[PDB]
Scaffold this active site. Structure first.
Site, PDB file in Angstrom:
ATOM      1  CE1 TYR A  65      37.133  23.454  43.400  1.00 31.74           C
ATOM      2  CE2 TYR A  65      36.575  23.111  45.709  1.00 31.74           C
ATOM      3  CZ  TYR A  65      37.415  23.638  44.742  1.00 31.74           C
ATOM      4  OH  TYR A  65      38.533  24.350  45.127  1.00 31.74           O
ATOM      5  NE  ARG A  68      40.705  28.910  42.315  1.00 31.09           N
ATOM      6  CZ  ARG A  68      41.995  28.584  42.339  1.00 31.09           C
ATOM      7  NH1 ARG A  68      42.373  27.316  42.434  1.00 31.09           N
ATOM      8  NH2 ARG A  68      42.914  29.533  42.257  1.00 31.09           N
ATOM      9  CD1 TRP A  74      45.632  27.702  46.442  1.00 28.75           C
ATOM     10  CD2 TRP A  74      45.321  26.937  48.524  1.00 28.75           C
ATOM     11  NE1 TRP A  74      45.159  28.743  47.205  1.00 28.75           N
ATOM     12  CE2 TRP A  74      44.961  28.303  48.487  1.00 28.75           C
ATOM     13  CE3 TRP A  74      45.205  26.240  49.734  1.00 28.75           C
ATOM     14  CZ2 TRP A  74      44.501  28.990  49.617  1.00 28.75           C
ATOM     15  CZ3 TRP A  74      44.742  26.926  50.860  1.00 28.75           C
ATOM     16  CH2 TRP A  74      44.400  28.288  50.788  1.00 28.75           C
TER      17      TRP A  74
HETATM   18  C1  M1W Z   1      44.986  18.513  43.598  1.00 29.10           C
HETATM   19  O1  M1W Z   1      44.814  19.931  43.698  1.00 29.10           O
HETATM   20  C2  M1W Z   1      43.853  20.348  44.676  1.00 29.10           C
HETATM   21  C3  M1W Z   1      44.284  21.686  45.285  1.00 29.10           C
HETATM   22  C4  M1W Z   1      43.537  21.928  46.600  1.00 29.10           C
HETATM   23  N1  M1W Z   1      43.070  23.318  46.624  1.00 29.10           N
HETATM   24  C5  M1W Z   1      42.842  24.039  47.751  1.00 29.10           C
HETATM   25  O2  M1W Z   1      43.017  23.593  48.866  1.00 29.10           O
HETATM   26  C6  M1W Z   1      42.374  25.424  47.527  1.00 29.10           C
HETATM   27  N2  M1W Z   1      41.451  26.164  48.129  1.00 29.10           N
HETATM   28  C7  M1W Z   1      41.487  27.351  47.461  1.00 29.10           C
HETATM   29  C8  M1W Z   1      40.676  28.584  47.595  1.00 29.10           C
HETATM   30  C9  M1W Z   1      39.705  28.763  48.575  1.00 29.10           C
HETATM   31  C10 M1W Z   1      38.953  29.933  48.603  1.00 29.10           C
HETATM   32  C11 M1W Z   1      39.138  30.927  47.661  1.00 29.10           C
HETATM   33  C12 M1W Z   1      40.089  30.765  46.658  1.00 29.10           C
HETATM   34  N3  M1W Z   1      40.501  31.542  45.599  1.00 29.10           N
HETATM   35  C13 M1W Z   1      41.488  30.911  44.898  1.00 29.10           C
HETATM   36  C14 M1W Z   1      41.752  29.728  45.465  1.00 29.10           C
HETATM   37  C15 M1W Z   1      40.859  29.589  46.620  1.00 29.10           C
HETATM   38  N4  M1W Z   1      42.377  27.237  46.514  1.00 29.10           N
HETATM   39  O3  M1W Z   1      42.889  26.153  46.541  1.00 29.10           O
HETATM   40  N1  GSH Z   2      40.165  30.761  38.345  1.00 22.36           N
HETATM   41  C1  GSH Z   2      39.554  29.440  38.310  1.00 22.36           C
HETATM   42  C2  GSH Z   2      40.505  28.420  38.921  1.00 22.36           C
HETATM   43  C3  GSH Z   2      40.018  26.983  38.735  1.00 22.36           C
HETATM   44  C4  GSH Z   2      41.052  26.029  39.297  1.00 22.36           C
HETATM   45  O1  GSH Z   2      42.427  26.241  39.062  1.00 22.36           O
HETATM   46  N2  GSH Z   2      40.591  25.003  40.007  1.00 22.36           N
HETATM   47  C5  GSH Z   2      41.437  24.241  40.906  1.00 22.36           C
HETATM   48  C6  GSH Z   2      40.616  23.649  42.042  1.00 22.36           C
HETATM   49  S1  GSH Z   2      40.818  24.658  43.519  1.00 22.36           S
HETATM   50  C7  GSH Z   2      42.170  23.134  40.215  1.00 22.36           C
HETATM   51  O2  GSH Z   2      43.268  22.524  40.859  1.00 22.36           O
HETATM   52  N3  GSH Z   2      41.733  22.784  39.010  1.00 22.36           N
HETATM   53  C8  GSH Z   2      42.008  21.463  38.473  1.00 22.36           C
HETATM   54  C9  GSH Z   2      43.392  21.294  37.874  1.00 22.36           C
HETATM   55  O3  GSH Z   2      44.004  22.262  37.367  1.00 22.36           O
HETATM   56  O4  GSH Z   2      43.947  20.168  37.864  1.00 22.36           O
HETATM   57  C10 GSH Z   2      38.270  29.489  39.084  1.00 22.36           C
HETATM   58  O5  GSH Z   2      38.123  30.331  40.004  1.00 22.36           O
HETATM   59  O6  GSH Z   2      37.335  28.705  38.803  1.00 22.36           O
END
Ligand code: M1W
Ligand code: GSH
Ligand code: M1W
Ligand code: GSH
Ligand code: MG
Lengths: 198, 198
Positions: free
Chosen positions: B7, B13, B103
């Site tokens: 990650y 996540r 995000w």
């Molecule tokens: C370049 O893309 C990176 C996006 C950065 N993402 C976040 O900061 C982020 N945290 C979460 C998160 C934290 C805890 C529970 C969650 N459930 C779905 C998203 C999420 N989602 O995005």
């Molecule tokens: N529902 C999926 C979401 C996975 C996901 O969208 N990951 C985020 C990280 S927070 C992401 O930006 N993935 C990489 C991308 O799409 O470029 C999970 O819970 O694993």
């Protein structure tokens, strides 16, 4: 065990539950409400969202939590602990995409734009990802049907309403859809269910 | 088993999986990446998203599918099939809401405005629902901690960064967070973990 499923009059998020009831040959009340009946039901619910499933006076919620519960220790669950994980992952991947759509959006032009974008730009990549994941195997997970194959068929049916050409370059995904539709209990439900767009 | 979690350097996540590993005392490699190695890595991923969990040559995906798999046959999952359904439902309700936040939004003003909108209208509504669901009970589901309690502490910890006053009229939800934080294996992990904003 007495079952009451409440949802809108459509396949939508409730259909996975309906397929599972059909396959396991379990009788349930298929309660479908109008939009105008929704607010008075919504205000009584712990989390204000449908589908809900009542079992012996206890109101369950979340479509996939319910589907997972109904399939636990049945042949629709994964055949190993690892397979159950794969089933859960595929289901969530599909759900992640379907959830992106602005289904309740009241402004038609804004709604159309978004549907178009998701179907034209995003849907083709998901199909590619799914096609490669399936490979030449008979089912998405393991050597027999799981509720992930159910969920694939259900999601793809709705997607094909808006974008009929979605699987033109993915015959193996079409074959999986058809295999699902051929299962006797599922074929039967497909034949007799209320016909709605969504 | 040779577990490897991949990650970003952040809770995000992946944190739910990290809590479960910690609490069940399961050893794993906590691999964190910068953006540098992201578009690189995004290729061998069958679905191009993180977190992923590699277990002896298999690349698992979907954070909650992975989490559930690791809780299998432990009290953490829920003590009955029915409780497991409640646990799954709460987790999905939480994940549905966290997914609403943009995000990745690059326009800083749009991001700010959307975050404020969600934390002003949606979050307090969900908080009332969560609070009343918990009531004066010890844990969200059953008589002992479940990974749903973990996920609530995890989601709210991040939400509190953006709206510090979010739980100021929800003492029972504050109490739940504190109960989760003080579980020794979680308390140990929270101290040991890298300090990141998200
Ligand atoms: C370049 O893309 C990176 C996006 C950065 N993402 C976040 O900061 C982020 N945290 C979460 C998160 C934290 C805890 C529970 C969650 N459930 C779905 C998203 C999420 N989602 O995005
Ligand atoms: N529902 C999926 C979401 C996975 C996901 O969208 N990951 C985020 C990280 S927070 C992401 O930006 N993935 C990489 C991308 O799409 O470029 C999970 O819970 O694993
Ligand atoms: C007031 O809202 C009426 C209900 C609107 N919902 C829909 O039109 C609809 N949702 C889905 C859907 C959403 C998320 C995951 C899904 N999986 C299968 C259908 C579906 N399909 O149609
Ligand atoms: N992730 C949930 C989402 C449930 C959901 O948001 N359902 C919609 C209908 S498809 C709904 O209750 N909309 C009406 C409302 O929000 O008041 C699930 O799968 O059950
Ligand atoms: Mg989900």
């Amino acid at each position: 065990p007495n079952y009451k499923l409440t949802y809108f009059n459509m396949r939508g998020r409730a259909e996975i539950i309906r397929y599972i009831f059909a396959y396991l040959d379990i009788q349930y009340e298929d309660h479908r409400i109008e939009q105008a009946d929704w607010p008075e039901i919504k205000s009584t619910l712990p989390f204000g969202k449908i589908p809900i499933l009542e079992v012996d006076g206890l109101t369950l919620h979340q479509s996939l939590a319910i589907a997972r519960y109904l399939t636990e220790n049945t042949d629709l669950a994964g055949n190993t602990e690892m397979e159950q994980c794969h089933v859960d992952a595929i289901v969530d991947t599909l759900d992640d995409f379907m959830s992106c759509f602005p289904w309740a959006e009241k402004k038609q032009d804004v709604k159309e734009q978004m549907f178009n974008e998701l179907l034209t730009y995003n849907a083709p990549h998901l199909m590619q990802d799914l096609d490669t994941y399936l490979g030449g195997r008979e089912w998405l997970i393991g050597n027999s049907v799981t509720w992930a194959d159910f969920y694939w068929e259900i999601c793809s049916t709705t997607l094909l309403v808006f974008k009929p050409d979605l699987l033109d370059n993915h015959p193996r995904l079409v074959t999986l859809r058809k295999k699902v539709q051929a299962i006797p209990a599922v074929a039967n439900w497909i034949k007799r269910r209320p016909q709605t767009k969504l």
